[PDB]
Design a protein around this ligand. Structure first.
Ligand code: HEC
Ligand code: HEC
Lengths: 125, 125
């Protein structure tokens, strides 16, 4: 859907920005600094699950650019594993949110964050 | 969810970028320049419906900035009407996509685009 590689870069940066807001806005909740409303979090995690499926299709071959490392492309199977593993961490977060289980939410949130940090150290300049 | 007004600006710009890609990538399909796969479009419009609910909460009071006109805030009921009417145009697009009805898709797509253009002329610098 991208006329030029720059358009893919702009898309994925935007998707990642949104994905980061939907994740990070729950930090006060997980820490107990903000109240836990199970319905609120269930709805937010549904938004996060949609967003978390979006960036990866905008790292197609030849879309080198932005803050992305060139290792994203040469090691296609491995980058894929990190994005697929991140989404299966998101599936666990959804399950926790759907259950309205704060303790399960906190644990799943920590796992998701670790997956963010890993892919970052690895595939972000 | 925004530490400073700039963070709201960045969020809404990103949401609007995503929303624009999910809408505009269907243009070749509506024009017949690309094939119509009803399942593909149904899934894409589901993504667009999620995205189309996101920008508006990032125009909260005091988040003046970006390319947004100051009329977004002083006329809160009217801006609201344009975003609510845009989303009800998206509901009609979803219905068309869910029905797998190309003619209904084209008509709904045109209505959505007109709603984009209107709010733009009005509330974008
Ligand atoms: C790889 C499988 C990643 C996972 C999982 C996550 N991110 Fe990441 N992120 C990744 C790359 C390769 C890039 C650079 C994209 C580019 O072309 O520039 C990024 C970027 C971000 C950004 C900055 C976006 C921008 O506006 O430019 C943020 C804020 C970000 N990523 C956050 C983030 C969070 C919180 C994640 C988990 C919820 C996460 N990312 C996962 C690669 C990957
Ligand atoms: C008001 C109710 C709007 C509707 C409906 C749509 N858009 Fe819009 N858009 C609007 C504003 C006020 C702004 C400026 C935001 C800012 O603070 O800068 C925008 C911006 C865009 C952008 C640019 C985003 C960026 O990266 O900076 C695009 C590409 C865009 N809008 C597209 C667009 C499309 C295609 C729409 C319908 C599917 C649409 N917008 C609706 C206000 C409103």
């Amino acid at each position: 859907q991208f006329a030029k590689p720059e358009d893919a870069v702009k898309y994925r940066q935007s998707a990642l920005t949104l994905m980061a807001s939907h994740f990070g806005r729950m930090t006060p909740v997980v820490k107990g600094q903000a109240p836990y409303d199970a319905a609120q979090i269930k709805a937010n995690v549904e938004v996060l699950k949609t967003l978390s499926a979006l960036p990866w299709a905008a790292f197609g071959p030849g879309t080198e650019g932005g803050d992305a490392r060139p290792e994203i492309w040469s090691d296609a199977a491995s980058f894929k594993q990190k994005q697929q593993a991140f989404q299966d961490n998101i599936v666990k977060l959804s399950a926790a949110a759907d259950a309205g289980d704060l303790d399960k939410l906190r644990a799943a949130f920590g796992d998701v964050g670790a997956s963010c940090k890993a892919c970052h150290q690895a595939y972000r300049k």
